[PDB]
Structures are given as C-alpha cells and as structure tokens.
Amino acid sequence: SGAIYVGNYRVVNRHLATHNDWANLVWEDSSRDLLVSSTTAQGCDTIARCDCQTGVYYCSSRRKHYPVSFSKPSLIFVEASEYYPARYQSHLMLAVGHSEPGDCGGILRCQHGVVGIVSTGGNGLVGFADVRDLLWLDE
Ligand SMILES: CSc1c(Br)cccc1CC(=O)N1CCC[C@H](C(N)=O)C1
Ligand SMILES: [Zn+2]
C-alpha cells in the first residue's frame, strides 16, 4: 500500500483505489495501473521532472529502502491477476530488486523528487508506474 500527495491530489495504484478515491476521481488509466483523486488537505510531495534511471524505493516487505537502476518508461507485458486480464502496461519501469504483492504503492525517488510507485514485480524484479510525465499534478 502507499500513495503520493502533491497539492490537492492523491496518486495511488488503480487496483488499490478506495470508494472515496472513485467518488473524488480526477483521472484514471487502467493501462498504467494509476488513479488520481482530489483531496481537501494540501500535499507536499515533490514530483521529479527528469530522465533519471537511478533512485531509491521503499520496500514494505523488508521495511527497507533500496537503491536501484531502472529502465525507461515503456510498454511491458503483465500476467493476468484478480484486478486485470493479461495485457501490456504502459509507462512501466523495471529494476532488479525485491518486491511482493503488498509492496505496491511504495515510492521510488531520485535526487529531483518522486519518480513513481511500485506497481508490478516477481522473479527478482520490481516494476514502477512512472508519474514524471503527469505535468498537471503541479497545477
Ligand atoms: C506477480 S505477483 C507480484 C509480485 Br511477485 C511482486 C510485486 C507485486 C505483485 C503483484 C502484481 O504484480 N500484480 C497484481 C496487482 C496488479 C499488478 C498490475 N500492475 O497489473 C500485477
Ligand atoms: Zn531525477
């Protein structure tokens, strides 16, 4: 579990969105596993605007942060699950690192700010949904 709070927005994994998130929906994209809902309180997370390929992510299954090198956002095949049929997930970045299903929502950050959130994994890999292209998160 986990979310990004920037201004009046809350960014979460679309498969973990609550009733409240959907009743306050701003934008959602099944192909990216992202959903953004509005908030009353102010968010103070900074979103990175960069092309970094190194950063640090929070891994709840280990209560630890890990440094990673990750790939550029791209279309990657993701196996079927209780939330989605088998499909290509866009804007996804992979890294070699530990992740378990409950790790989704852990933040990936670089020196410039928040890069994305854990969205997929397995087999010694971790996948992050990128948010650096969502320029509207700051306006
Ligand atoms: C492959 S199970 C797993 C592992 Br292992 C580590 C980390 C995470 C998982 C769960 C997982 O990847 N998915 C279930 C939830 C929705 C995800 C998606 N984006 O389509 C797919
Ligand atoms: Zn960066």
From Swiss-Prot:
Active site: 15 (for protease 2a activity), 33 (for protease 2a activity), 104 (for protease 2a activity)
Tree of life domain: Viruses
Positions contributing to Zn(2+) 1 binding: 50, 52, 110, 112
Catalytic activity of the protein: Selective cleavage of Tyr-|-Gly bond in the picornavirus polyprotein
Coiled coil start-end: none
Purpose of the protein: Cysteine protease that cleaves viral polyprotein and specific host proteins. It is responsible for the autocatalytic cleavage between the P1 and P2 regions, which is the first cleavage occurring in the polyprotein. Also cleaves the host translation initiation factor EIF4G1, in order to shut down the capped cellular mRNA translation. Inhibits the host nucleus-cytoplasm protein and RNA trafficking by cleaving host members of the nuclear pores. Counteracts stress granule formation probably by antagonizing its assembly or promoting its dissassembly.
Subunit details: Homodimer.
Record protein name field: Protease 2A
Residue range from the parent sequence: 869 to 1007 of 2193
